[PDB]
Design an enzyme around this catalytic site. Structure first.
Site, PDB file in Angstrom:
ATOM      1  N   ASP A 134    -116.839   9.363   6.922  1.00  0.00           N
ATOM      2  CA  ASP A 134    -115.690   9.249   7.818  1.00  0.00           C
ATOM      3  C   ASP A 134    -115.118   7.838   7.810  1.00  0.00           C
ATOM      4  OD1 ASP A 134    -113.832   9.436   9.810  1.00  0.00           O
ATOM      5  OD2 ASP A 134    -115.289   9.624  11.463  1.00  0.00           O
ATOM      6  N   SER A 137     -97.148   3.311   4.821  1.00  0.00           N
ATOM      7  CA  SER A 137     -96.481   4.072   3.784  1.00  0.00           C
ATOM      8  C   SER A 137     -95.007   3.695   3.760  1.00  0.00           C
ATOM      9  CB  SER A 137     -96.662   5.563   4.053  1.00  0.00           C
ATOM     10  OG  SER A 137     -95.867   6.366   3.190  1.00  0.00           O
TER      11      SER A 137
END
EC number: 3.4.23.22
Length: 330
Positions: free
Chosen positions: A35, A199
């Site tokens: 994770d 992004s």
């Protein structure tokens, strides 16, 4: 040193991925959910409340000659999906894919929430976010990666998750045969303890690319792709009959649909998520309403590039002095 381990979807939907991890001496192999959005290595154990164990493999520290109780240490974690667990702490030898760390904090669960009990395939979590998020008190502990880093050939790990197929976690090296083209690296902020990056935009299907900054985290421990409501609405508007359902808890779509791809930007590069990666199947057995793999982050407080996004790429988690993230197509 290096390590390399195969990671395997837990079910036919790729709801999560499990990777075998050797703990203790002799080894006890548990299948952990790696994770990159958390920083605790915790396991089902011989200390876990019996009624809360249902099929998981447990760690029994009393059977490990290298286990030592970390005196006075406790831990307690709550995840973004509302699940939680807590317990005490041992140090022990932990190996992943041939890479060994001695003295790793292994957090033994005394209690786990129902979602963990109900998932027989996940024996615990191995956190790969920054150690500043580790919950051990009163002395915070380091992640497996943080402990291994100095020994690694290069201070990196890579995630190569499969779509409906196994994939690979590598530690200490970049497998140049595992991706196509080049890896585009992008800046990381560690301010919130995550692999947080920005992004450069998105496209829906064959549509034009929208240049827009989207801050979010690379999180292998989250199944879906959570993005701003504007972006998510633009995606689902291209699927006839798709709608946001308050009762179901997100966007659903007719199972008869063909889903468009979704592209996200990494610098000037582009990662394309095929439409089929966005299908999470019937909302309940036999339903013709299917659950979407792109959902709104509104009310999460952060955008999350979870498995839906990451499995479309070869992803480098670069733990150099100034961390960065790399993405390649594959």
């Amino acid at each position: 040193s290096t390590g390399s381990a195969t990671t395997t979807p837990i079910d036919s939907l790729d709801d999560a991925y499990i990777t075998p991890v050797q703990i203790g001496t002799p080894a006890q192999t548990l299948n952990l959910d790696f994770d990159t959005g958390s920083s605790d290595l915790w396991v089902f154990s011989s200390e876990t409340t019996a009624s809360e164990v249902d099929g998981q493999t447990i760690y029994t520290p009393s059977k490990s000659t290298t286990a030592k109780l970390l005196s006075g240490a406790t831990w307690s974690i709550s995840y973004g999906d509302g699940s939680s667990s807590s317990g005490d702490v041992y140090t022990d030898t932990v190996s992943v894919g041939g890479l060994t760390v001695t003295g790793q904090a292994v957090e033994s669960a005394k209690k786990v929430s129902s979602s963990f009990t109900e998932d027989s395939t996940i024996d615990g979590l191995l956190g790969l976010a920054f150690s500043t998020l580790n919950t051990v008190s009163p002395t915070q502990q380091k992640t497996f990666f943080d402990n291994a880093k100095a020994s690694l050939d290069s201070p990196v790990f890579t995630a190569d998750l499969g779509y409906h197929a196994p994939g690979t976690y590598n530690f200490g090296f970049i497998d140049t045969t595992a991706y196509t083209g080049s890896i585009t690296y992008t800046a990381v902020s560690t301010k919130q303890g995550f692999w947080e990056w920005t992004s450069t935009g998105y496209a829906v299907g064959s549509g034009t690319f929208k240049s827009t900054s989207i801050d979010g985290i690379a999180d292998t421990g989250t199944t879906l792709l959570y993005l701003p409501a504007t972006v998510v609405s633009a995606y689902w508007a291209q699927v006839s009959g798709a709608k946001s359902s308050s009762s179901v808890g997100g966007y659903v779509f007719p199972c008869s649909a063909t889903l468009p791809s979704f592209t996200f930007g990494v610098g000037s590069a582009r990662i394309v998520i095929p439409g089929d990666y966005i299908d999470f199947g019937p909302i309940s057995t036999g339903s013709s309403s299917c659950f979407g793999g792109i959902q709104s982050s509104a009310g999460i407080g952060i955008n999350i590039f979870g498995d839906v996004a990451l499995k479309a790429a070869f992803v480098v988690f670069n733990g150099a002095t100034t961390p960065t993230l790399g993405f390649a197509s594959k």
